[PDB]
Tab-separated table of N, CA and C and ligand atoms in Angstrom:
chain	number	residue	atom	x	y	z
A	6	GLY	N	-8.285	-16.461	-4.242
A	6	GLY	CA	-6.903	-16.478	-3.742
A	6	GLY	C	-6.770	-15.267	-2.682
A	7	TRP	N	-7.768	-14.878	-1.821
A	7	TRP	CA	-7.631	-13.849	-0.913
A	7	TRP	C	-7.197	-14.648	0.486
A	8	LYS	N	-6.152	-14.075	0.939
A	8	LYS	CA	-5.584	-14.348	2.190
A	8	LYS	C	-6.127	-13.614	3.349
A	9	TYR	N	-6.553	-14.390	4.405
A	9	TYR	CA	-7.127	-13.755	5.704
A	9	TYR	C	-6.169	-13.353	6.777
A	10	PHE	N	-6.364	-12.194	7.335
A	10	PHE	CA	-5.564	-11.795	8.389
A	10	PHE	C	-6.348	-10.696	9.284
A	11	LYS	N	-6.535	-11.110	10.513
A	11	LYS	CA	-7.179	-10.289	11.520
A	11	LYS	C	-8.370	-9.511	10.965
A	12	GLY	N	-9.410	-10.237	10.605
A	12	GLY	CA	-10.525	-9.612	10.230
A	12	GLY	C	-10.626	-8.992	8.703
A	13	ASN	N	-9.590	-9.077	7.997
A	13	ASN	CA	-9.468	-8.670	6.666
A	13	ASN	C	-8.959	-9.785	5.530
A	14	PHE	N	-9.643	-9.733	4.419
A	14	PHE	CA	-8.956	-10.596	3.351
A	14	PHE	C	-8.089	-9.623	2.518
A	15	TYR	N	-7.048	-10.183	1.925
A	15	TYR	CA	-5.984	-9.462	1.178
A	15	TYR	C	-5.743	-10.294	-0.064
A	16	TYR	N	-5.779	-9.492	-1.380
A	16	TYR	CA	-5.272	-10.014	-2.617
A	16	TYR	C	-3.927	-9.381	-3.112
A	17	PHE	N	-3.183	-10.415	-3.201
A	17	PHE	CA	-1.866	-10.068	-3.783
A	17	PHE	C	-1.919	-10.355	-5.127
A	18	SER	N	-1.725	-9.299	-6.108
A	18	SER	CA	-2.082	-9.478	-7.415
A	18	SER	C	-1.068	-10.104	-8.202
A	19	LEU	N	-1.368	-10.854	-9.261
A	19	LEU	CA	-0.412	-11.570	-10.162
A	19	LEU	C	0.125	-10.765	-11.400
A	20	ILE	N	-0.713	-9.684	-11.637
A	20	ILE	CA	-0.562	-8.792	-12.698
A	20	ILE	C	-0.212	-7.371	-12.408
A	21	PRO	N	0.888	-6.747	-12.883
A	21	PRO	CA	1.118	-5.418	-12.510
A	21	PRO	C	0.239	-4.377	-13.161
A	22	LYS	N	-0.189	-3.141	-12.299
A	22	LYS	CA	-0.905	-2.351	-12.876
A	22	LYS	C	-0.397	-0.727	-12.284
A	23	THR	N	-0.784	0.313	-12.876
A	23	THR	CA	-0.418	1.643	-12.267
A	23	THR	C	-1.325	1.651	-11.022
A	24	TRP	N	-0.860	2.521	-10.111
A	24	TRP	CA	-1.588	2.704	-8.918
A	24	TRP	C	-3.093	2.824	-9.037
A	25	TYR	N	-3.624	3.645	-9.904
A	25	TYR	CA	-5.042	3.773	-10.099
A	25	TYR	C	-5.703	2.840	-10.810
A	26	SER	N	-5.093	2.184	-11.851
A	26	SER	CA	-5.824	1.032	-12.403
A	26	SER	C	-5.868	-0.080	-11.434
A	27	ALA	N	-4.903	-0.200	-10.449
A	27	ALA	CA	-4.819	-1.167	-9.346
A	27	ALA	C	-6.127	-0.783	-8.443
A	28	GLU	N	-6.163	0.438	-8.095
A	28	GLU	CA	-7.336	0.804	-7.150
A	28	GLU	C	-8.542	0.556	-7.791
A	29	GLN	N	-8.817	0.797	-9.048
A	29	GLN	CA	-10.054	0.409	-9.609
A	29	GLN	C	-10.352	-0.865	-9.807
A	30	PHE	N	-9.376	-1.727	-9.966
A	30	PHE	CA	-9.498	-3.246	-9.941
A	30	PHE	C	-9.854	-3.753	-8.468
A	31	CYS	N	-9.397	-3.220	-7.403
A	31	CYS	CA	-9.897	-3.404	-6.021
A	31	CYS	C	-11.205	-3.214	-5.825
A	32	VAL	N	-11.459	-1.839	-6.347
A	32	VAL	CA	-12.925	-1.408	-6.151
A	32	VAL	C	-13.782	-2.326	-6.756
A	33	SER	N	-13.531	-2.786	-8.037
A	33	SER	CA	-14.452	-3.703	-8.690
A	33	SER	C	-14.560	-5.113	-7.942
A	34	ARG	N	-13.559	-5.321	-7.010
A	34	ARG	CA	-13.750	-6.584	-6.156
A	34	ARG	C	-14.180	-6.187	-4.801
A	35	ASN	N	-15.035	-5.114	-4.760
A	35	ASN	CA	-15.445	-4.600	-3.400
A	35	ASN	C	-14.371	-4.576	-2.373
A	36	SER	N	-13.297	-3.842	-2.647
A	36	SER	CA	-12.228	-3.771	-1.918
A	36	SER	C	-11.409	-2.439	-2.301
A	37	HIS	N	-10.475	-2.160	-1.577
A	37	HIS	CA	-9.357	-0.932	-1.819
A	37	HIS	C	-7.955	-1.483	-1.763
A	38	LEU	N	-7.161	-0.774	-2.388
A	38	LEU	CA	-5.854	-0.833	-2.094
A	38	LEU	C	-5.577	-0.726	-0.606
A	39	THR	N	-4.623	-1.597	0.029
A	39	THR	CA	-4.650	-1.803	1.312
A	39	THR	C	-4.085	-0.538	2.137
A	40	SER	N	-4.684	-0.319	3.239
A	40	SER	CA	-4.057	0.531	4.283
A	40	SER	C	-3.037	-0.309	5.185
A	41	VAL	N	-2.162	0.431	5.988
A	41	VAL	CA	-1.441	-0.184	7.144
A	41	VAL	C	-1.644	0.577	8.268
A	42	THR	N	-2.118	-0.109	9.294
A	42	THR	CA	-2.602	0.406	10.485
A	42	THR	C	-1.798	-0.014	11.740
A	43	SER	N	-1.102	-0.992	11.580
A	43	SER	CA	-0.241	-1.543	12.783
A	43	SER	C	1.054	-2.043	12.370
A	44	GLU	N	1.809	-2.303	13.404
A	44	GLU	CA	3.185	-3.017	12.855
A	44	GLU	C	2.956	-4.416	12.547
A	45	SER	N	2.018	-5.143	13.057
A	45	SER	CA	1.560	-6.568	12.770
A	45	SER	C	0.975	-6.496	11.465
A	46	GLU	N	0.254	-5.659	10.953
A	46	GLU	CA	-0.286	-5.676	9.564
A	46	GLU	C	0.915	-5.245	8.581
A	47	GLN	N	1.763	-4.539	9.054
A	47	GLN	CA	2.801	-4.145	8.048
A	47	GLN	C	3.758	-5.385	7.879
A	48	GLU	N	3.910	-6.092	9.170
A	48	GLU	CA	4.735	-7.292	9.052
A	48	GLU	C	4.111	-8.427	8.223
A	49	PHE	N	2.693	-8.531	8.349
A	49	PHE	CA	2.027	-9.699	7.526
A	49	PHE	C	2.192	-9.263	6.101
A	50	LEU	N	2.150	-7.915	5.718
A	50	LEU	CA	2.046	-7.465	4.307
A	50	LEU	C	3.603	-7.547	3.651
A	51	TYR	N	4.602	-7.361	4.474
A	51	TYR	CA	5.841	-7.398	3.830
A	51	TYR	C	6.343	-8.842	3.700
A	52	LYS	N	6.022	-9.630	4.654
A	52	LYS	CA	6.362	-11.002	4.680
A	52	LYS	C	5.686	-11.670	3.532
A	53	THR	N	4.357	-11.450	3.298
A	53	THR	CA	3.592	-12.008	2.287
A	53	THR	C	4.022	-11.642	0.958
A	54	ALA	N	4.456	-10.385	0.941
A	54	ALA	CA	5.145	-9.785	-0.322
A	54	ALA	C	6.299	-10.537	-0.801
A	55	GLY	N	7.118	-11.012	0.129
A	55	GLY	CA	8.238	-11.959	-0.154
A	55	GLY	C	9.234	-11.306	-1.001
A	56	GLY	N	9.566	-10.037	-0.629
A	56	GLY	CA	10.725	-9.282	-1.346
A	56	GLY	C	10.283	-8.580	-2.709
A	57	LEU	N	9.056	-8.785	-3.203
A	57	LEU	CA	8.576	-7.974	-4.396
A	57	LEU	C	7.944	-6.823	-4.022
A	58	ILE	N	7.747	-5.803	-5.043
A	58	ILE	CA	7.203	-4.512	-4.857
A	58	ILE	C	5.640	-4.510	-5.140
A	59	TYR	N	4.836	-4.082	-4.260
A	59	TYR	CA	3.385	-3.961	-4.490
A	59	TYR	C	2.848	-2.619	-3.906
A	60	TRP	N	1.996	-2.019	-4.905
A	60	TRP	CA	1.363	-0.739	-4.531
A	60	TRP	C	0.552	-1.197	-3.532
A	61	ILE	N	0.433	-0.280	-2.479
A	61	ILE	CA	-0.728	-0.091	-1.326
A	61	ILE	C	-1.345	1.128	-1.503
A	62	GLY	N	-2.259	1.437	-0.487
A	62	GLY	CA	-3.228	2.575	-0.705
A	62	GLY	C	-2.817	3.887	-0.378
A	63	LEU	N	-1.370	3.980	-0.234
A	63	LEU	CA	-0.867	5.255	0.017
A	63	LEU	C	-0.735	6.150	-1.115
A	64	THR	N	-1.222	7.422	-0.945
A	64	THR	CA	-1.396	8.407	-1.960
A	64	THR	C	-1.458	9.813	-1.430
A	65	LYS	N	-1.303	10.920	-2.176
A	65	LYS	CA	-1.284	12.225	-1.696
A	65	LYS	C	-2.515	12.828	-1.652
A	66	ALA	N	-2.812	13.730	-0.818
A	66	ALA	CA	-4.118	14.415	-0.590
A	66	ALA	C	-3.819	15.947	0.054
A	67	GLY	N	-4.834	16.703	-0.181
A	67	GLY	CA	-4.562	18.260	0.205
A	67	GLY	C	-3.749	19.013	-0.591
A	68	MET	N	-3.526	20.179	-0.542
A	68	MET	CA	-2.567	21.117	-1.171
A	68	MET	C	-1.156	21.035	-0.571
A	69	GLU	N	-1.093	20.370	0.582
A	69	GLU	CA	0.249	20.261	1.217
A	69	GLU	C	0.925	18.837	0.961
A	70	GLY	N	0.363	18.140	0.206
A	70	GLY	CA	0.975	16.912	-0.191
A	70	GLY	C	1.161	15.943	0.930
A	71	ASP	N	0.236	15.991	1.840
A	71	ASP	CA	0.021	15.002	2.953
A	71	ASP	C	-0.263	13.658	2.468
A	72	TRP	N	0.341	12.562	3.029
A	72	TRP	CA	-0.107	11.304	2.667
A	72	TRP	C	-1.390	10.769	3.121
A	73	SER	N	-2.001	9.869	2.473
A	73	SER	CA	-3.326	9.441	3.010
A	73	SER	C	-3.550	8.134	2.451
A	74	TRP	N	-4.668	7.419	2.991
A	74	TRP	CA	-5.011	6.242	2.673
A	74	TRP	C	-6.261	6.142	1.701
A	75	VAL	N	-6.123	5.626	0.610
A	75	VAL	CA	-7.406	5.671	-0.446
A	75	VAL	C	-8.611	5.125	0.320
A	76	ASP	N	-8.513	4.048	1.228
A	76	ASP	CA	-9.713	3.544	1.765
A	76	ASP	C	-10.183	4.343	2.951
A	77	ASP	N	-9.715	5.597	3.123
A	77	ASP	CA	-10.099	6.813	3.919
A	77	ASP	C	-9.687	6.509	5.360
A	78	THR	N	-9.030	5.421	5.727
A	78	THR	CA	-8.372	5.392	7.159
A	78	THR	C	-7.486	6.617	7.319
A	79	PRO	N	-7.791	7.287	8.480
A	79	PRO	CA	-6.994	8.513	8.673
A	79	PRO	C	-5.562	8.072	8.634
A	80	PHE	N	-4.654	8.944	8.035
A	80	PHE	CA	-3.220	8.602	7.940
A	80	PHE	C	-2.671	9.313	9.446
A	81	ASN	N	-1.840	8.485	9.917
A	81	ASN	CA	-1.179	8.700	11.292
A	81	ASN	C	0.259	9.112	11.053
A	82	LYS	N	0.562	10.339	10.833
A	82	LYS	CA	1.987	10.791	10.522
A	82	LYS	C	3.144	10.289	11.455
A	83	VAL	N	2.717	10.272	12.949
A	83	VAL	CA	3.611	9.882	13.870
A	83	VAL	C	3.732	8.361	13.884
A	84	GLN	N	2.583	7.549	13.852
A	84	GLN	CA	2.574	6.145	14.038
A	84	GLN	C	3.074	5.355	12.682
A	85	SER	N	3.338	6.292	11.662
A	85	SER	CA	3.784	5.714	10.383
A	85	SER	C	5.225	5.856	10.097
A	86	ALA	N	5.652	6.998	10.551
A	86	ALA	CA	7.140	7.543	10.440
A	86	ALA	C	8.152	6.424	10.229
A	87	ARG	N	7.921	5.443	11.066
A	87	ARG	CA	8.782	4.181	11.070
A	87	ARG	C	8.609	3.293	9.896
A	88	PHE	N	7.567	3.493	9.039
A	88	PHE	CA	7.286	2.411	8.168
A	88	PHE	C	7.785	2.692	6.809
A	89	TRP	N	8.424	3.936	6.643
A	89	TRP	CA	9.160	4.353	5.393
A	89	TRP	C	10.500	3.639	5.288
A	90	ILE	N	11.052	3.309	4.105
A	90	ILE	CA	12.509	2.980	3.922
A	90	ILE	C	13.189	4.302	4.361
A	91	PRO	N	14.275	4.094	5.134
A	91	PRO	CA	15.309	5.235	5.436
A	91	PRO	C	15.581	6.110	4.158
A	92	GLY	N	15.042	7.237	4.178
A	92	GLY	CA	15.274	8.162	2.933
A	92	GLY	C	14.120	8.501	2.213
A	93	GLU	N	13.049	7.709	2.377
A	93	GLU	CA	11.830	7.975	1.790
A	93	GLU	C	10.811	8.357	2.774
A	94	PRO	N	9.583	9.242	2.309
A	94	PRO	CA	9.590	9.349	0.910
A	94	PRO	C	10.572	10.526	0.404
A	95	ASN	N	10.801	10.568	-0.901
A	95	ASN	CA	11.929	11.398	-1.248
A	95	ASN	C	11.415	12.503	-2.277
A	96	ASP	N	10.198	12.061	-2.723
A	96	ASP	CA	9.673	12.763	-3.960
A	96	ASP	C	10.692	12.863	-5.056
A	97	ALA	N	11.225	11.693	-5.367
A	97	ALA	CA	12.298	11.793	-6.512
A	97	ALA	C	11.685	12.310	-7.923
A	98	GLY	N	12.202	13.303	-8.274
A	98	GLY	CA	11.728	13.863	-9.635
A	98	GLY	C	10.589	14.688	-9.231
A	99	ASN	N	10.032	14.847	-8.050
A	99	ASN	CA	8.807	15.615	-7.852
A	99	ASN	C	7.745	15.016	-8.575
A	100	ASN	N	7.582	13.632	-8.662
A	100	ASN	CA	6.565	12.916	-9.364
A	100	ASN	C	6.167	11.725	-8.694
A	101	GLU	N	6.393	11.591	-7.491
A	101	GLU	CA	6.203	10.440	-6.649
A	101	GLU	C	5.062	10.525	-5.733
A	102	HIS	N	3.672	10.320	-6.132
A	102	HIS	CA	2.710	10.870	-5.162
A	102	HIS	C	1.857	9.583	-4.711
A	103	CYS	N	2.495	8.391	-4.918
A	103	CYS	CA	1.762	7.065	-4.590
A	103	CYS	C	2.760	6.346	-3.811
A	104	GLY	N	2.322	5.374	-2.866
A	104	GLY	CA	3.241	4.588	-2.162
A	104	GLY	C	3.105	3.011	-2.400
A	105	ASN	N	4.340	2.280	-2.253
A	105	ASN	CA	4.368	0.837	-2.362
A	105	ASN	C	5.141	0.314	-1.188
A	106	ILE	N	4.829	-1.147	-1.045
A	106	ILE	CA	5.705	-1.857	-0.216
A	106	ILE	C	6.894	-2.470	-1.016
A	107	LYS	N	8.149	-1.998	-0.465
A	107	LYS	CA	9.270	-2.284	-1.240
A	107	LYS	C	10.225	-3.197	-0.662
A	108	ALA	N	10.619	-2.857	0.544
A	108	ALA	CA	11.800	-3.577	1.361
A	108	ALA	C	10.940	-4.598	2.153
A	109	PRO	N	11.493	-5.704	2.364
A	109	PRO	CA	11.001	-6.823	3.380
A	109	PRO	C	11.612	-6.528	4.749
A	110	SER	N	11.038	-5.389	5.327
A	110	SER	CA	11.376	-4.850	6.495
A	110	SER	C	10.388	-4.104	7.077
A	111	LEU	N	10.367	-3.741	8.435
A	111	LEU	CA	9.130	-2.767	8.966
A	111	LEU	C	9.346	-1.410	8.347
A	112	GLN	N	10.576	-1.120	7.997
A	112	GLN	CA	10.826	0.057	7.096
A	112	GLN	C	10.862	-0.274	5.845
A	113	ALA	N	9.382	-0.374	5.230
A	113	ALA	CA	9.147	-0.976	3.962
A	113	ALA	C	8.787	-0.169	2.833
A	114	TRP	N	8.251	1.059	3.045
A	114	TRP	CA	7.619	1.887	2.083
A	114	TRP	C	8.532	2.767	1.333
A	115	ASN	N	8.200	2.937	0.001
A	115	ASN	CA	8.813	4.022	-0.886
A	115	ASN	C	7.807	4.661	-1.648
A	116	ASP	N	7.914	5.928	-1.854
A	116	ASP	CA	7.048	6.589	-2.858
A	116	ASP	C	7.565	6.476	-4.120
A	117	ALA	N	6.701	6.392	-5.132
A	117	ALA	CA	6.981	6.099	-6.402
A	117	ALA	C	5.960	6.848	-7.525
A	118	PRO	N	6.405	7.168	-8.647
A	118	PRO	CA	5.227	7.531	-9.687
A	118	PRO	C	4.099	6.757	-9.651
A	119	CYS	N	2.997	7.315	-9.747
A	119	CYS	CA	1.684	6.527	-9.780
A	119	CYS	C	1.448	5.898	-11.127
A	120	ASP	N	2.305	6.328	-12.096
A	120	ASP	CA	1.941	5.853	-13.333
A	120	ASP	C	2.718	4.630	-13.750
A	121	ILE	N	3.703	4.217	-12.817
A	121	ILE	CA	4.494	3.147	-12.933
A	121	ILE	C	3.615	1.806	-12.510
A	122	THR	N	3.661	0.799	-13.338
A	122	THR	CA	3.076	-0.545	-13.096
A	122	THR	C	3.847	-1.449	-12.015
A	123	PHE	N	3.116	-1.707	-10.993
A	123	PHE	CA	3.669	-2.922	-10.047
A	123	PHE	C	2.491	-3.678	-9.649
A	124	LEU	N	2.757	-4.952	-9.376
A	124	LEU	CA	1.818	-5.792	-8.416
A	124	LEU	C	1.148	-4.982	-7.310
A	125	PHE	N	0.038	-5.382	-6.780
A	125	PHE	CA	-0.633	-4.488	-5.923
A	125	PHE	C	-1.492	-5.424	-4.905
A	126	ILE	N	-1.842	-4.608	-3.720
A	126	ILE	CA	-2.509	-5.535	-2.723
A	126	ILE	C	-3.833	-4.886	-2.311
A	127	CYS	N	-5.050	-5.630	-2.706
A	127	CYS	CA	-6.182	-5.200	-2.257
A	127	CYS	C	-6.617	-5.511	-0.903
A	128	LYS	N	-7.516	-4.983	-0.145
A	128	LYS	CA	-7.830	-5.237	1.260
A	128	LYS	C	-9.369	-5.044	1.230
A	129	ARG	N	-9.993	-6.046	1.868
A	129	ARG	CA	-11.502	-6.125	2.004
A	129	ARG	C	-11.786	-6.807	3.456
A	130	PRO	N	-12.762	-5.959	3.994
A	130	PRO	CA	-13.070	-6.635	5.488
A	130	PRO	C	-13.999	-7.735	5.292
A	131	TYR	N	-13.901	-8.484	6.381
A	131	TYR	CA	-14.803	-9.705	6.694
A	131	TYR	C	-16.048	-9.009	7.248
A	132	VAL	N	-17.107	-9.318	6.709
A	132	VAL	CA	-18.253	-8.767	7.460
A	132	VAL	C	-19.316	-10.053	7.540
A	133	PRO	N	-19.217	-10.582	8.747
A	133	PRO	CA	-20.141	-11.784	9.288
A	133	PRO	C	-21.441	-11.375	9.318
B	1	LIG	C1	10.439	4.974	-10.426
B	1	LIG	C2	10.975	4.426	-9.171
B	1	LIG	O1	10.455	3.433	-8.668
B	1	LIG	N1	11.905	5.243	-8.437
B	1	LIG	C3	12.615	4.765	-7.272
B	1	LIG	C4	13.834	4.155	-7.594
B	1	LIG	O2	13.906	2.967	-8.153
B	1	LIG	C5	14.804	2.953	-9.252
B	1	LIG	C6	14.280	2.047	-10.358
B	1	LIG	O3	13.168	2.648	-11.156
B	1	LIG	C7	15.423	1.978	-11.408
B	1	LIG	O4	15.132	1.169	-12.545
B	1	LIG	O5	16.721	1.261	-10.817
B	1	LIG	C8	17.273	1.969	-9.611
B	1	LIG	C9	18.180	1.211	-9.128
B	1	LIG	O6	18.949	0.611	-10.142
B	1	LIG	C10	16.148	2.344	-8.665
B	1	LIG	O7	15.790	1.255	-7.844
B	1	LIG	O8	14.743	4.124	-6.437
B	1	LIG	C11	14.826	5.270	-5.593
B	1	LIG	C12	15.719	4.896	-4.367
B	1	LIG	O9	15.564	3.713	-4.152
B	1	LIG	C13	13.460	5.637	-5.084
B	1	LIG	O10	13.329	6.645	-4.247
B	1	LIG	C14	12.508	5.949	-6.399
B	1	LIG	O11	11.230	6.500	-5.916
B	2	CA	CA1	10.925	7.370	-3.551
């Protein structure tokens, strides 16, 4: 049930998991929680999400609490600023160190507690 989009396959889970158990699931399927590196990828993801909430590969790194991608895609603070839901990230409760796709809009991301369970999206490159 992997969906193909521009050189990558994506798995939209049917079962919710915490961020890290989701990541571990992805890794077991030779993938990672998805990165988002273009407007078109963001659009494919939120449209496919169909208004439900999915963990993506957004998580905190370094002592400064910079956002990063678990698949090691360099996180571009400038090119991504427009992908957060207006008002996010807010570190609500100072315990929101992971990111999900939440709104069906280009401004789609919310930061949420890593230990909360949601559906999730794995991403796997097609290697011919
Ligand atoms: C834990 C979490 O997702 N917090 C975000 C928060 O979401 C909450 C729900 O968890 C709660 O059950 O319902 C209220 C509305 O009734 C919120 O949707 O919402 C915050 C703002 O949207 C967000 O910043 C939190 O991270
Ligand atoms: Ca938040």
